[PDB]
Amino acid sequence: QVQLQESGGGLVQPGGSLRLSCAASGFTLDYYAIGWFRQAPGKEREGVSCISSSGGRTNYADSVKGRFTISRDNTKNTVYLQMNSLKPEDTAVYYCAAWEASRWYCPLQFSADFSSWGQGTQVTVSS
Amino acid sequence: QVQLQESGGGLVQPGGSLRLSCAASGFTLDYYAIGWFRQAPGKEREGVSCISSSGGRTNYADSVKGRFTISRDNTKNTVYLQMNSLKPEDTAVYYCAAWEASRWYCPLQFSADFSSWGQGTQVTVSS
Amino acid sequence: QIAPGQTGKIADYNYKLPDDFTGCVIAWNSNNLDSKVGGNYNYLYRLFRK
């Protein structure tokens, strides 16, 4: 009954802003590290932003640094991603994942398996 | 102060799964045999599943073989009923009843008096 | 599919887990250990049973 649901996708103007929400049902999301992942048309799935279980550690892809902000609420069992200064390079399907750190060290810079995956939401930036 | 309390009822999709609980307060549930009973809209209260006091003997109604699994925790003073492959024919109010064997023989296939009853819980199967 | 009360090809055909499970299910990736360039076909899976 473990399920992760993304929301907030839509069509926006370049230079505009959008916000996604990643909610979990049937299991508590606070223990897990959550990362936001994207698959551009004709491209592979890349890691854009991840945030620790407690939220004390974050990482961002260099393409979105200074533009994206990830945050989470362990009381409401949700992880958000704030999008600002969106670009046509940011048109793809947005995926949210939850997993546990696969290596020693606090940082979430490294990638690994992702235990749970959602169905994803579409973010389109075009004008 | 003897109480039997059902829990876990709700609304589920056909083919899905649901799990009920029966807890006892004011008395020790381990010495009693427990049976799960349901009444469908317009139907009489039929015996779904029963389990012995020690849990070594069980009985189920032919409509639910291969789909429902009954068990109990005598340390936690609870009896559980797991429902799988749930069908619209199972939409009913489910009671848990505790009683003692009124006949010779270990098996619980026969029906008899039921000393204590809960207030029942509703499970609805519709899609 | 490895958790109690679940269905699927593995959960129904390979190895059934009863509803009343006491223990832990613990798993990780073996991409660099069990995969080969030409494909590792030494693990066989059933899809049909009576």
Curated annotation (Swiss-Prot), chain C:
Superkingdom, taxonomy of origin: Viruses
Region (Immunodominant HLA epitope recognized by the CD8+): 40-48
Function field: Attaches the virion to the cell membrane by interacting with host receptor, initiating the infection. The major receptor is host ACE2. When S2/S2' has been cleaved, binding to the receptor triggers direct fusion at the cell membrane. When S2/S2' has not been cleaved, binding to the receptor results in internalization of the virus by endocytosis using host TFRC and GRM2 and leading to fusion of the virion membrane with the host endosomal membrane. Alternatively, may use NRP1/NRP2 and integrin as entry receptors.
Quaternary structure, from the entry: Binds to host ACE2. RBD also interacts with the N-linked glycan on 'Asn-90' of ACE2. Cleavage of S generates a polybasic C-terminal sequence on S1 that binds to host Neuropilin-1 (NRP1) and Neuropilin-2 (NRP2) receptors. Interacts with host integrin alpha-5/beta-1 (ITGA5:ITGB1) and with ACE2 in complex with integrin alpha-5/beta-1 (ITGA5:ITGB1). May interact via cytoplasmic c-terminus with M protein. May interact (via N-terminus) with host bilirubin and biliverdin, thereby preventing antibody binding to the SARS-CoV-2 spike NTD via an allosteric mechanism.
Name listed for the protein in its UniProt record: Spike protein S1
Source species taxonomy: Viruses, Riboviria, Orthornavirae, Pisuviricota, Pisoniviricetes
Whole sequence portion shown: 409 to 458 of 1273
